[PDB]
Design a protein around this ligand. Structure first.
Ligand SMILES: C[C@@H](NC(=O)[C@H](CS)NC(=O)CCC[C@H](N)C(=O)O)C(=O)O
Ligand SMILES: [Fe+2]
Length: 329
């Protein structure tokens, strides 16, 4: 007997346009959801999301164990020391069910100043062989720019929601330096299902991934129509219903930092469900040196005691802590 969570569907199309009052009315809906369960679905987002699903299914289902070693992150392949973030995250049959492929900003090439200077969190994407996966790199790169465009529009809504000018976050979310990532997650069907891949909550619920706050400004998530997400509320954990036509949005712990917990980063987790499904998050992260002053929209004056925190240190530390709390993925 678990409840459904209030996860309103908000038409974000006005954030792409120039009707200011219409943008305010969207911002009011984002303010309301951000202060309630902390989730909403963005609809009328303009992304070709059936193609995203199909191309991702194609990749996941045609990639071979050989390819996966050749693309693997440092945790699965020691030869691959630079890859802490970007690459393949392998399955372990009998033990670990999930697997995935993470990629970063496509403008991180050997000549980008940030990979010349070896700045942490910045990596050059690895890719499969073009003729084994025809069109995949081109598809994936363009998806990165499509969701970047969406996320950019959402962030104008968050800014307006908070009483700011609309470019308040978005001006620091730039194609040249953003540390945003796409992750293409596969959660497979299996029996026998490997028991070491299931965790049990304090309430008995079986899980594929335990409670956590996201490491992001916001998170912009496509998922297949299989129900799996729960958010923690004052009244206990609630089910987030699936909607494969929409993007599930929520704040991460950096928005909570920037707003003195006014927009909280909702605590959530993933139920274990034995079904073939996709989780494709885009983590909206700012540039390495972005350091917005924390504010407080509770206060007549808007002043916060919190100290600024540069996005790169935030992210490097947060990613590492997520792995320590909830395991290597
Ligand atoms: C939405 C999706 N998220 C996840 O699996 C979890 C929790 S938000 N996220 C992560 O592991 C963080 C990956 C960061 C990525 N490698 C990067 O370098 O940026 C899910 O749980 O299905
Ligand atoms: Fe999450």
């Amino acid at each position: 007997s678990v409840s459904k969570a209030n996860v309103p569907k908000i038409d974000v199309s006005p954030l792409f346009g120039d009707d200011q009052a219409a943008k305010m009315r969207v911002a009011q809906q984002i303010d309301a959801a951000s202060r309630d369960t902390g989730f909403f679905y963005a609809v009328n987002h303009g992304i070709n999301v059936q193609r995203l699903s199909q191309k991702t299914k194609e990749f996941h289902m045609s990639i071979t164990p050989e390819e996966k070693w050749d693309l693997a992150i440092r945790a699965y392949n020691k030869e691959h020391q630079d890859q802490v973030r970007a690459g393949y995250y392998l399955s372990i049959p009998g033990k670990k069910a999930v697997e995935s492929f993470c990629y970063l900003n496509p403008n991180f090439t050997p000549d980008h100043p940030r990979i010349q200077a070896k700045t942490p969190t910045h990596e050059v994407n690895v890719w499969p062989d073009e003729t084994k996966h025809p069109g995949f790199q081109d598809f994936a790169e363009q998806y990165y720019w499509d969701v970047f465009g969406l996320s950019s529009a959402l962030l104008k809504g968050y800014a307006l929601a908070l009483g700011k000018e609309e470019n308040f976050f978005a001006r620091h979310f730039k194609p040249d330096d953003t540390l945003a990532s796409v992750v293409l997650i596969r959660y497979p069907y299996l029996d026998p299902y490997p028991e070491a891949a299931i965790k049990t909550a304090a309430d008995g619920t079986k899980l594929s991934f335990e409670w956590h706050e996201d490491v992001s400004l916001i998170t912009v998530l496509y998922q297949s129509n299989v129900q799996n997400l729960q958010v923690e509320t004052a009244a206990g954990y609630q089910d987030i219903e699936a909607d494969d036509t929409g993007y599930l949005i929520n704040c991460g712990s950096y928005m909570a930092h920037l707003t003195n917990n006014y927009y909280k980063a909702p605590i959530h987790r993933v139920k274990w469900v034995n079904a073939e499904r996709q989780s494709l998050p885009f983590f909206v992260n700012l540039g390495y040196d972005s350091v917005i002053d924390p504010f407080d929209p509770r206060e007549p004056n808007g002043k916060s005691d919190r100290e600024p925190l540069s996005y790169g240190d935030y992210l490097q530390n947060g990613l590492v802590s997520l792995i320590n709390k909830n395991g290597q993925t």
